[model samples]
Target: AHLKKRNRLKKNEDFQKVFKHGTSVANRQFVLYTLDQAENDELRVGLSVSKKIGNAVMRNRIKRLIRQAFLEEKERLKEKDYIIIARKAASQLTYEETKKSLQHLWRKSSLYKK
Candidate 1:
């Protein structure tokens, strides 16, 4: 599924808000943060992969995995703004491993839709 513009968190302020007021969960590969939003608003997501994770290609790969995971499970997520941050260990994990980390964190945050 395509991740539309409306489904992406674009602004620095939006990122900051989630970082400040959102709840969080983490595993070895990724950190998931979420802030509940209005019922009328769509679920939105952002990704953060630091340079320390690896070279540009590795960092980009981690981001693509995270985004693909989120897109695949988008409907299962609650209505909220989310930030998924890749840790240094993320580069070592496979796409499936990264997806598992995201799923585990999402479940930990209780963001799964019933």
Candidate 2:
């Protein structure tokens, strides 16, 4: 079935609010969560990778994988501000593994709740 594609979060404020001000809920190598509300129905998300994780390229890889995971699973999310951050372990995982980890985290965080 065709689903509306408007549930993804985007914006600096939303990302900062979620990562900085919001309380985090984690599982495995990923953390899925929401922060304060936004002006539009549009969803905003951010990815955080620490320097200890790896070099710039490695960190960027992890970020891309995480973003891909979000796009793949966008159908499952609802209206909320989303922010995803990477743990050190996340930097070591492969692309597919990263995606799986994110999917699992999303489910565990209840962000995919109907």
Candidate 3:
């Protein structure tokens, strides 16, 4: 699966806004932040992995795994910005492990249509 650029939150200000105002949820490896946009119509996602996690190669692998999880989940969501922050322990996770963390956090954040 592929993540389209338009579905990603890429701008600095957008990330800042989500960081400043978005509500968040987390387990052991990832933190999920979400801010609803009443006017927009699609989901936008941003990901951050700190240098504190590991070297560049490890960080990039975790980021890529997170994106893969996003593409596979395929859940319906409201118009919003999703900012995902990977914890230090995330560097050692496999793709399946990464996918499960997202599913865990997605519900933990109360994103299921209710």
Candidate 4:
């Protein structure tokens, strides 16, 4: 599955809006924030990993994992805006570990289709 430019959440205000108003679910690895979009809208995703997690290289690598995992599961996701924030524990996880963690979070958060 491809996560195109339109499917990415790019604006800072958009991120802030989700931060302020979205509902969330978290596990030891990550926190998933979700806000409803208008009916029939495509899912849009944003990813964040704090500098506290690591240097630029590590952070970008984690973001890549998150984006890839999300794309893998995108078809099952709702028409919503999602922001996935990586926790410090996520820095140590392998790509497969991160992917599984994300799938678990998706189920817990009801982001996966019923």
Candidate 5:
């Protein structure tokens, strides 16, 4: 199935909202910021891979994998924005495993409909 392009939480206010309004949960390699699912249809997202995760290249690589994971599993999620903050462990994870890890978070948040 074709996955739609997802939007990022861009503004400083948006980031603050996620931090203040959302609940944080630790996944295998990431910390997930999740709000309620019934609020809106827009599934905005943000990715934060810190320097602690790795050097610039490795951090970006992990971000790419996480983005792809979200794309592959987007269909299973509910209608709400999600911000995924990456940790150092994420740098060592494979793309496919990242996808599964994200799926696990999706399930835990009860956002997975599939």
Candidate 6:
């Protein structure tokens, strides 16, 4: 599924707002910051993949993997704003590993729907 533009955080301040007030959870590979948006009807996301992970190709690959994994689990995630920051360790993750890391994070953060 496509993560629409409206659901993807683009501006710096948009990301900053979540970082400032969001509740966060993490493991070695990924970090999640969640901001409650009670009025929104869908999940919104911001992603951060640092150069510390690897070259440009590697970072974009991880970003794409993160987006894909997110869509697959979107049905179970609650409506809110989420920022996903990929850690240096994430450079070695495969698609399956990426999805598992994210799922593990959501579990710990109580972001799943009942």
Residue 110, model 2, lDDT: 70
C-alpha displacement of 71 in model 4, angstroms? 0.9
Report the Cα lDDT for candidate 3. 0.84
For residues 1-114, write the lDDT of model 1, one tens digit per residue. 667788888999989989998788888778888888876268888998878865798888878887888888988887789898888988878878988888888878888879
In model 6, which regions exceed 4 Å deviation?
none
Given candidate 4, what's the lDDT at residue 112?
74
lDDT of 2 at 41: 61
On a 0 to 1 TM-score scale, where does candidate 4 land against the true structure? 0.92
lDDT of 4 by residue, 1-114 (tens): 557887799999999999998899999989999998776369899998877986788898899888888788777788799999999999978889999999898888877775
Candidate 5 at 39: error in angstroms? Answer: 5.9
lDDT of 5 at 5: 60
Weakest ten-residue segment in model 6 by summed lDDT: 1-10
Error of 5 at 49 (Å): 1.1
Candidate 4 Cα outliers beyond 4 Å, as residue runs: none
Q: Across residues 1-114, which tens digit of lDDT does each residue of candidate 5 receive?
A: 323564456777777788898887886588998866475666777788887864788887887887777777666666677889887777888888888788788777788775
Model 1 has an lDDT value of: 0.84
Runs off by more than 4 Å, candidate 5: 1-6, 37-39
lDDT (10s digit) by residue, model 6, range 1-114: 666786777889979999998798889998899999888788888899888976899998899899888888888999899899999999978999999999999999988888
Badly placed stretches (over 4 Å) of model 3 are none
> Which predicted model would earn the best lDDT?
6
Give lDDT per model, in order.
Answer: 0.84, 0.69, 0.84, 0.87, 0.76, 0.88
Model 4 gets an lDDT of 0.87
